[PDB]
Amino acid sequence: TLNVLADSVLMEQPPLRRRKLEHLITELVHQRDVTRSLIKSKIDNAKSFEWLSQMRFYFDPKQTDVLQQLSIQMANAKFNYGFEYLGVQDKLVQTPLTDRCYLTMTQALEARLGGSPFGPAGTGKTESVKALGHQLGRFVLVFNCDETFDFQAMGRIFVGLCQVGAWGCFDEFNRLEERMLSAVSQQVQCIQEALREHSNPNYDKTSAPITCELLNKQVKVSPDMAIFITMNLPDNLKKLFRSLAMTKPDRQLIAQVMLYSQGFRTAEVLANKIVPFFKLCDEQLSSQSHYDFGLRALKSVLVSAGNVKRERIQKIKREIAENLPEQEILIQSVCETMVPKLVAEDIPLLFSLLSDVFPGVQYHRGEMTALREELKKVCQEMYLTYGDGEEVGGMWVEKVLQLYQITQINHGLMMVGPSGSGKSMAWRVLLKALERLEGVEGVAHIIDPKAISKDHLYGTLDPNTREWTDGLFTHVLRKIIDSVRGELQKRQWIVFDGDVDPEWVENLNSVLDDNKLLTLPNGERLSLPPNVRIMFEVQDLKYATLATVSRCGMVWFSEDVLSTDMIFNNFLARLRSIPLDDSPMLQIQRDAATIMQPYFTSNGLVTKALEHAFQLEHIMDLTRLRCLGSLFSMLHQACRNVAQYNANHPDFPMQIEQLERYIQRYLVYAILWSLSGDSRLKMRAELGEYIRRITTVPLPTAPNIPIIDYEVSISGEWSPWQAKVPQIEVETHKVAAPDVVVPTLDTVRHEALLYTWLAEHKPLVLCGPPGSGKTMTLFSALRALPDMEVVGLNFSSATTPELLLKTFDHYCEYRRTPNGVVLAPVQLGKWLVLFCDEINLPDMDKYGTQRVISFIRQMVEHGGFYRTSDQTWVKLERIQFVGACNPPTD
Amino acid sequence: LKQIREVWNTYELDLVNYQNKCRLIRGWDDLFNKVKEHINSVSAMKLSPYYKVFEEDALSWEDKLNRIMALFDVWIDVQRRWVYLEGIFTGSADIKHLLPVETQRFQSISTEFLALMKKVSKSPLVMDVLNIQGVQRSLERLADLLGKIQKALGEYLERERSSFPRFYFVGDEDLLEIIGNSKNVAKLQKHFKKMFAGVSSIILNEDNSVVLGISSREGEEVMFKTPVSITEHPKINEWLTLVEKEMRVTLAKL
Amino acid sequence: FLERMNTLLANGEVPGLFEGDEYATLMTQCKEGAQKEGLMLDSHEELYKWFTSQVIRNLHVVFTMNPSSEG
Amino acid sequence: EAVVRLSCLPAFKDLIAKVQADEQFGIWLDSSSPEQTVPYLWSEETPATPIGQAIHRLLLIQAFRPDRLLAMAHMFVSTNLGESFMSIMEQPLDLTHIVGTEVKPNTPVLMCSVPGYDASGHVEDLAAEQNTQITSIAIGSAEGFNQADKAINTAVKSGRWVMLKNVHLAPGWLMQLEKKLHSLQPHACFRLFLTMEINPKVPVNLLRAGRIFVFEPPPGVKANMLRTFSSIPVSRICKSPNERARLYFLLAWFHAIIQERLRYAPLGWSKKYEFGESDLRSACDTVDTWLDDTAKGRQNISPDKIPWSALKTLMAQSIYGGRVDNEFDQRLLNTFLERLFTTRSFDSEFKLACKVDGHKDIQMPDGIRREEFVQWVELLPDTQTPSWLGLPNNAERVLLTTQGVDMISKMLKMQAWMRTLHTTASNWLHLIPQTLSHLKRTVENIKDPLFRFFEREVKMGAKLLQDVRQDLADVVQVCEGKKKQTNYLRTLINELVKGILPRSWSHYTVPAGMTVIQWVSDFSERIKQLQNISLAAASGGAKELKNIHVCLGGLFVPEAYITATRQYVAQANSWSLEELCLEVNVTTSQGATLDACSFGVTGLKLQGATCNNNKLSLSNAISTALPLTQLRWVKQTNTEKKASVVTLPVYLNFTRADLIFTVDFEIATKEDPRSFYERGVAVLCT
Numbered sequence A: 001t002l003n004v005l006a007d008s009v010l011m012e013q014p015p016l017r018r019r020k021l022e023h024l025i026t027e028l029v030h031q032r033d034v035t036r037s038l039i040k041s042k043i044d045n046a047k048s049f050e051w052l053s054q055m056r057f058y059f060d061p062k063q064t065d066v067l068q069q070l071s072i073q074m075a076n077a078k079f080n081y082g083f084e085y086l087g088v089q090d091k092l093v094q095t096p097l098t099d100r101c102y103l104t105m106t107q108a109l110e111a112r113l114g115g116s117p118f119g120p121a122g123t124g125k126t127e128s129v130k131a132l133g134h135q136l137g138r139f140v141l142v143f144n145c146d147e148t149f150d151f152q153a154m155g156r157i158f159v160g161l162c163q164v165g166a167w168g169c170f171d172e173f174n175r176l177e178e179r180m181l182s183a184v185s186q187q188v189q190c191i192q193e194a195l196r197e198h199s200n201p202n203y204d205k206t207s208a209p210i211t212c213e214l215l216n217k218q219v220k221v222s223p224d225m226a227i228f229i230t231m232n233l234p235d236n237l238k239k240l241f242r243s244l245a246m247t248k249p250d251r252q253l254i255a256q257v258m259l260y261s262q263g264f265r266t267a268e269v270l271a272n273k274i275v276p277f278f279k280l281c282d283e284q285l286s287s288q289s290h291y292d293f294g295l296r297a298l299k300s301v302l303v304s305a306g307n308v309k310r311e312r313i314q315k316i317k318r319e320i321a322e323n324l325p326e327q328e329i330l331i332q333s334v335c336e337t338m339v340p341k342l343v344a345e346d347i348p349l350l351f352s353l354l355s356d357v358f359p360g361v362q363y364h365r366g367e368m369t370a371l372r373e374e375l376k377k378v379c380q381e382m383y384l385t386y387g388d389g390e391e392v393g394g395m396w397v398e399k400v401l402q403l404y405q406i407t408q409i410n411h412g413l414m415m416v417g418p419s420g421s422g423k424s425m426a427w428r429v430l431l432k433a434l435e436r437l438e439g440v441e442g443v444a445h446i447i448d449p450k451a452i453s454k455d456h457l458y459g460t461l462d463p464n465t466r467e468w469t470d471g472l473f474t475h476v477l478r479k480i481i482d483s484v485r486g487e488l489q490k491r492q493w494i495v496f497d498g499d500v501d502p503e504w505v506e507n508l509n510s511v512l513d514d515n516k517l518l519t520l521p522n523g524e525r526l527s528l529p530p531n532v533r534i535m536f537e538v539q540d541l542k543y544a545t546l547a548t549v550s551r552c553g554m555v556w557f558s559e560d561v562l563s564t565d566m567i568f569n570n571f572l573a574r575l576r577s578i579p580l581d582d583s584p585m586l587q588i589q590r591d592a593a594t595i596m597q598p599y600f601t602s603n604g605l606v607t608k609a610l611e612h613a614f615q616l617e618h619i620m621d622l623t624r625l626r627c628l629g630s631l632f633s634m635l636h637q638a639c640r641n642v643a644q645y646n647a648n649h650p651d652f653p654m655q656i657e658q659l660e661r662y663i664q665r666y667l668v669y670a671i672l673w674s675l676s677g678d679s680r681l682k683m684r685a686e687l688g689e690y691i692r693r694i695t696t697v698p699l700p701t702a703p704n705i706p707i708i709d710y711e712v713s714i715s716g717e718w719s720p721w722q723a724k725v726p727q728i729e730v731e732t733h734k735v736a737a738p739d740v741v742v743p744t745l746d747t748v749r750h751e752a753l754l755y756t757w758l759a760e761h762k763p764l765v766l767c768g769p770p771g772s773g774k775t776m777t778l779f780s781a782l783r784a785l786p787d788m789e790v791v792g793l794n795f796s797s798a799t800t801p802e803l804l805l806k807t808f809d810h811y812c813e814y815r816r817t818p819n820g821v822v823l824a825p826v827q828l829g830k831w832l833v834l835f836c837d838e839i840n841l842p843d844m845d846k847y848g849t850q851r852v853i854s855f856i857r858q859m860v861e862h863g864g865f866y867r868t869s870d871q872t873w874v875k876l877e878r879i880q881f882v883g884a885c886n887p888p889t890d
Numbered sequence B: 001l002k003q004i005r006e007v008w009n010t011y012e013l014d015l016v017n018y019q020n021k022c023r024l025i026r027g028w029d030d031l032f033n034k035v036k037e038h039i040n041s042v043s044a045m046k047l048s049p050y051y052k053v054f055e056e057d058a059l060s061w062e063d064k065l066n067r068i069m070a071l072f073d074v075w076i077d078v079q080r081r082w083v084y085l086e087g088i089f090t091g092s093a094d095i096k097h098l099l100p101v102e103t104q105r106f107q108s109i110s111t112e113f114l115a116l117m118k119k120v121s122k123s124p125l126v127m128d129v130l131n132i133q134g135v136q137r138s139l140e141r142l143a144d145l146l147g148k149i150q151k152a153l154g155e156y157l158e159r160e161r162s163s164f165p166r167f168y169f170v171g172d173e174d175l176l177e178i179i180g181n182s183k184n185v186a187k188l189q190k191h192f193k194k195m196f197a198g199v200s201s202i203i204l205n206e207d208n209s210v211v212l213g214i215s216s217r218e219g220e221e222v223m224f225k226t227p228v229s230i231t232e233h234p235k236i237n238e239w240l241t242l243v244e245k246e247m248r249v250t251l252a253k254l
Numbered sequence C: 001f002l003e004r005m006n007t008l009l010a011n012g013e014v015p016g017l018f019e020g021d022e023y024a025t026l027m028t029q030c031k032e033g034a035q036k037e038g039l040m041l042d043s044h045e046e047l048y049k050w051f052t053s054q055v056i057r058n059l060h061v062v063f064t065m066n067p068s069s070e071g
Numbered sequence D: 001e002a003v004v005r006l007s008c009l010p011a012f013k014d015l016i017a018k019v020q021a022d023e024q025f026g027i028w029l030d031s032s033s034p035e036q037t038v039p040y041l042w043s044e045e046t047p048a049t050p051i052g053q054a055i056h057r058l059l060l061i062q063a064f065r066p067d068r069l070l071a072m073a074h075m076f077v078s079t080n081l082g083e084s085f086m087s088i089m090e091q092p093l094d095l096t097h098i099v100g101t102e103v104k105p106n107t108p109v110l111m112c113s114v115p116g117y118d119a120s121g122h123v124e125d126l127a128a129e130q131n132t133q134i135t136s137i138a139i140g141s142a143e144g145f146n147q148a149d150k151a152i153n154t155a156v157k158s159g160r161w162v163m164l165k166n167v168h169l170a171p172g173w174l175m176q177l178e179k180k181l182h183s184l185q186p187h188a189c190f191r192l193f194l195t196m197e198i199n200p201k202v203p204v205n206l207l208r209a210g211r212i213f214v215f216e217p218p219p220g221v222k223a224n225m226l227r228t229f230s231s232i233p234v235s236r237i238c239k240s241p242n243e244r245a246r247l248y249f250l251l252a253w254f255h256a257i258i259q260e261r262l263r264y265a266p267l268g269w270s271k272k273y274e275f276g277e278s279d280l281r282s283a284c285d286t287v288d289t290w291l292d293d294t295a296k297g298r299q300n301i302s303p304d305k306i307p308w309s310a311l312k313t314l315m316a317q318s319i320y321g322g323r324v325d326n327e328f329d330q331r332l333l334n335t336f337l338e339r340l341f342t343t344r345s346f347d348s349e350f351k352l353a354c355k356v357d358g359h360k361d362i363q364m365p366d367g368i369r370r371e372e373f374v375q376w377v378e379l380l381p382d383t384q385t386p387s388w389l390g391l392p393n394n395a396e397r398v399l400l401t402t403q404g405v406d407m408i409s410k411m412l413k414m415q416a417w418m419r420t421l422h423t424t425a426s427n428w429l430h431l432i433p434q435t436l437s438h439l440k441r442t443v444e445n446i447k448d449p450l451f452r453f454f455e456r457e458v459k460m461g462a463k464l465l466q467d468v469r470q471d472l473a474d475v476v477q478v479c480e481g482k483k484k485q486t487n488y489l490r491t492l493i494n495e496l497v498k499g500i501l502p503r504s505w506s507h508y509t510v511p512a513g514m515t516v517i518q519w520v521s522d523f524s525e526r527i528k529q530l531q532n533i534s535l536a537a538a539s540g541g542a543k544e545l546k547n548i549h550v551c552l553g554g555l556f557v558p559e560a561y562i563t564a565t566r567q568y569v570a571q572a573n574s575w576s577l578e579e580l581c582l583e584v585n586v587t588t589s590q591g592a593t594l595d596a597c598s599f600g601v602t603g604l605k606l607q608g609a610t611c612n613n614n615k616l617s618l619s620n621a622i623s624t625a626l627p628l629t630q631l632r633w634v635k636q637t638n639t640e641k642k643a644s645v646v647t648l649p650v651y652l653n654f655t656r657a658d659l660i661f662t663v664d665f666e667i668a669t670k671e672d673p674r675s676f677y678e679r680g681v682a683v684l685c686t
């Protein structure tokens, strides 16, 4: 029968019949080992314990009562079969640990005691209890005792278990806190003491059914019911519960039986290889909060390997025939699931371990040439870098392909990696490539959490009128579900860019799982359409619950996927194509890029300078994207200085000769002020000295004066800043008066950088010790600009995004949808800057996220935010942000 | 006391609309904390020796504050109970046929409550509605009636849950939905998932009057050996028990 | 309390303090003060600015504290 | 070392010189109780006071034979307070004298009992002898609280002795009782008894306001068996086939043996399992049901027909093995059950325990009725060595040494300090080695699993060393006052003054509670071996790492070292990882040549056994040093292991809480594996 089943699982079967087959292989394998042990033990008597200790089934159709036709006996227990339809469910491999669990729990059931499996999580205590309950046909309930535990429900749930004859399993019962643990223990003790009297020596025949008190009234207790307390126990239940140590399951046996039920020949070798490999991955690989090398992950890898093998054989058929290498099929399944979650350091380690446990075999990746060609078209027009392997951009495109695979498999993908990796670019390029290849439109809803209150994210009920108002994500789900507007032919990717946090994913945990439904406070349920993908673009998983991380697949975007060469290529491609002025500007931009191309290459001036600056000391934590973006903005200004120079001089425009010598020196100036503009003067001098010995750009002749003290002017010459500091004589009534600045070395150069970075409308933060002159340096440049009106705003610990909202309402007006709702200042032609006093002052949350900082980041990066009144996207028109702060060490 | 004598002169009830197009009171925090502060202040001033400018100005208003507090802390309970029971009696169907005396008593109660709400809306002044006689006694009668009818609804839910004990696995709102949508059987299929282990749907007749079997999440069907007709067993608990029994019997025969 | 005093000291105005009826009453009394102090009435924003400046020149906040430097 | 530390004391300047002579010193050291007579080794001429000699002998006993520390302290208390001081504790306490006179009716008598013991019988006999009625009440029922309150109200006015059973279940009601007991009681005869187990959640206010009596189960197999036989009803043991009496006797013997082995928890069963009356009740129920099923009638059934397999399997897998966590405690449970529960247990020459007290044995009582088994149990000798339990005789010495160290620690915790903390921190800084270097990483050695493991180990050790150095130098700087401490520094000082290991310094597995000085010492040893490893890696890339005679105890994750060695052997050949099995060779000379697949380790200690060349043999002296234990990985042939080999667990600490790996050893030609299993033989890294 086993041979027939194993020959019938290789071919094409319906999924239901496939599951029936696999259940049959599991039982027939268990029966095969049991019979083989009986044969080897020379068992002849049918009353021997070696046979009497096995779960045995006795079926007698002659009985008129439905419930007692089938009798199941384990050792001396005699349960009837609750003829309740279980569905299809999932079947456990009867390992010796599972057999011991069955024996112990059945013995506890006969003694009218309870079963209390204990051990590390993931062993199979809850699943073994459920499997035993399903073997006897009982309606088994599992109560999750870690969180989302409804105490008010337990009162009637226990009564239901009593009056139905249903079981009950408490997954991780010790996770309950003492207040609710004590009362649940009291109810469980009442139930157990009521159930213990069913086996009274003198009252075994209970003419009057035995009752307990749960709802302040007597309720009958059926003998068929049971309660199981799985742990990781209260003195009430110590005398009424049998305990079993479920410490370590037989992973090799489970793997072998599952592989054999998947149709794998030589499943024993594959299991005894894959289990040690999963053991090593918990030792040799760096510990990550998202790594799952447990039993559930192993089972998932095994079923995926079975699917891969069936796909391979059915592909070969359309070109029995059982000559495929099983190990290579197992390795592909491991690598198609574990590599996306691996950090860049663990990727070579995984293949080293693979070559250790599976020597000689190699992992070959699906080419997906169809999508890799549309990637080259979505890129090269978004000014990004494409790769095809070891070449530049290969890691990023591999991460995009893995992201595509996870979107195909899962629906709650979670792109995670250090800030500065190409996560957002990856999913944007994937969305565009999918829209091009499949012809299905893709619309992205980038909802930023931690910027609005959770009530505004979902909604709430007013306790007086009981009227329901929907939140942002809830309204998005409504507009996707209720209104069609090409529903099935639009890819709604609801990207949750921001920081992951338990509080706003409590409601999402019901959506990330297979339920795919959102439960609202008012009781309505909305089901997620299959086109919707809930994407979590987050920086780290430090404050993510195990439920949320384990409920969805992910791809890890390490910092190594996006190299510096790729960023330089993006900068130069955007420079040569996108006009800074929204025709001669493009020409001068291309000339600038050509002049400055040899420095923006592999190694070279910029790479060496950035590497050297990373080992210096800065007031804030050094981020590569921060320095690179500041450098790019300064260089963009260097191409506008040429525009103004040409405009001022219609005749005799600056030719390539002057432009070359100007931009070579401006590149060094911008490198110095961008890679060391947040460090001490000694660090600036050190960076200048390092630059002097590695550059070919002509530098200031005087060696005793740092390069940081010079300016490039417009003629391509180092003009010292001291030549640009005037000697002013302030009138007597304005001596040391507010908003009175005497020019000096620092105020003439910092003002230059402020002009440079405000002409781009780029947000900036002025960092320095208190009273150093950050505010005065800013207002000496802001109010100089005719149209750059300033809005005073002070940030304290209790500051929340509502402060920015009230500032916007007071100084800005919402346009009546020219093209969507746009937030613009009341006056036209004037730019508002919201000076951020102590931008780093706001209080750190318990989950490491300042709400106002994330709120302003949402509109610095995505150019807007979401209104809380009608849940519509509002776009900033002429709003600019400027910050100032003391050093973070204070 | 100077501000106390004028805060009551200008004080709106701040009426709001309802899903049934009726007026209700939304303001409760300002209507409790401010009155408590005023009564504490007047009690302190009367107790305090420095009162020889207000020899008699708060005793005539201490009783007014007590009347405000009693009327409105009964009113909040009245309105909360009324809106909850209005939702229960209107959202779910067959509430007229099931519990007819309760439904008619609640209809009369809602008529009285809406008449009172119209009376308070025509003069949205708290002084102008405290002067109306019989408001306190009518409100306590209304609250006590609401308590009794809510208790009766709970008792009916308990007696319907006692039969077919699988109802103990669902909440009060879910069980009200189950027992109210007797005609619209198609809404029950979302609750069978929690009431059973594996059963998720019931295979009904062409006109959804005879239960031919059950189904599951995957789609596996279990045709009943003897289908049960809801027509001959109109009550939901009866045919649900019959469905469970026939499921057991069908599983045994198969 | 300290959050409110932060704005009362650094800038001299508390934005999230006078809202609704309080804001209108404050405008009434401050414009009346401007009239009785020989000050020309201006727009609501300019009148608010004048009131804030009046607070600047007519308000002194004193903090007394334990010499415990840890506090 | 103890001699050296005692010689540091001024009273023992001449201690090596004086122990050179007096050849009787060795005989005294080997004496069973070398505290009755102690050699004069302190250098004192004039002092002859009894207290001075007593304390000098106490220090000598702490130096020589610290297992007799409890006895020496008892003699010291005898000298300082007379030889009758503790004798009041030996006699059985009489509650009548305490309760009648110096127990006020306001004060509630707390009937404190160790879990697994009941103390209601004492006061029941008290009431029987004093003919006073008791309104005994069980605690745990909702109506039980009201009934107890009504009994309190109706008994204070009449002075009726109220009793509450297991009142520790409810802490809130006990708080209410303690609060309400402040009210005066009209009657003086009132005496309130709260029977309650030693539970840390019990209110402290009740403990302060009440008289606490502590009762413990008397140690010994004989007392345990008397307790079990008294618990079991006479009717339940006498009926049915007469073999049930001997089955109950065997069950009582097994239960007593496994509970008295719990006292020797390190060397007995690795951790303290809970084996109270519930397990014995379940085993009795199992025996009842299976003898009813097998022997339907009342006939004298043959022992061969006894369902031995059913009882052994149910008591090894379901009711006694259901609490065993690891493999080896389960193996020893199985060993006991196979040894006892067999048809040979009904013979007349069947030994309950062999090798006991040298060469004697404990015979089975040839009995048919419970009376003869009980009389046999009460005829057991008062003397009981740990050899009754299958454990070696020196388990008593180990337990006594542990108890002496515990008493020393308790007195130490029952004892400005800027200067002492400063000097100890400076001594730690001087002794702890300097920074650790990891400046070797070549492309060719990234493939080596040994290099990867050693690199991760050295990196983690260097980071933790830098953290410890920085924190301890910060502590030093705060000591002089030139730096101000913070909350982390405050809790660090609070931990260091009490000598408890800081939680921030714990990143590798350490014994559950140890002195910070020991942590600093073993940390210094670990850093020293890591420096040696780094120096070897600097000298050579992949040649010296294999030839490192590493100390397995000092590794932060020695199991990772075993895995890395397996990986290295797998890469050396074309073999895969799962195709390898560990072979272990213990040598004598340190300069023994190492093979290509062989890996030498040092510091391994063998417990309760010794090896001549590579064959184990039992030894009464525990902790036999294994010099240069070689680990070999070989192509396993998938053959069954012989019956002349044993699988010993390899633990890292003296406490047996974490398994590193398992080692197979060939035993000598005389010993059997079962004796190794029951003697607690294992290999220890530290």
Ligand SMILES: Nc1ncnc2c1ncn2[C@@H]1O[C@H](COP(=O)(O)OP(=O)(O)OP(=O)(O)O)[C@@H](O)[C@H]1O
Pocket (backbone or CB within 6 Å): A384, A385, A386, A393, A396, A417, A418, A419, A420, A421, A422, A423, A424, A425, A426, A537, A538, A539, A562, A566, A567, A568, A569, A570, A571
């Ligand atoms: N080939 C490339 N692919 C992707 N991004 C590139 C590439 N070349 C340069 N870049 C730049 O690198 C950055 C990619 O970061 P991206 O915006 O995708 O990150 P994010 O997930 O939104 O945010 P963060 O990295 O801070 O978490 C952009 O500034 C982009 O212009």
Ligand SMILES: Nc1ncnc2c1ncn2[C@@H]1O[C@H](COP(=O)(O)OP(=O)(O)O)[C@@H](O)[C@H]1O
Pocket (backbone or CB within 6 Å): A091, A092, A093, A094, A095, A098, A119, A120, A121, A122, A123, A124, A125, A126, A127, A128, A171, A230, A249, A254, A295, A296, A299
């Ligand atoms: N004997 C077994 N055969 C097959 N799968 C098992 C077995 N034991 C455990 N598992 C799997 O392990 C996974 C986790 O087990 P679980 O019941 O969550 O353990 P715990 O409750 O101890 O955390 C389950 O998905 C289950 O399928």
Ligand SMILES: Nc1ncnc2c1ncn2[C@@H]1O[C@H](COP(=O)(O)OP(=O)(O)O)[C@@H](O)[C@H]1O
Pocket (backbone or CB within 6 Å): A736, A740, A741, A742, A743, A744, A747, A768, A769, A770, A771, A772, A773, A774, A775, A776, A777
């Ligand atoms: N040229 C100058 N450079 C530096 N500081 C100056 C200069 N001119 C005036 N100052 C004084 O420096 C102080 C800096 O004040 P402020 O800008 O509030 O400091 P911060 O912005 O660091 O909080 C001002 O009070 C101003 O009087």
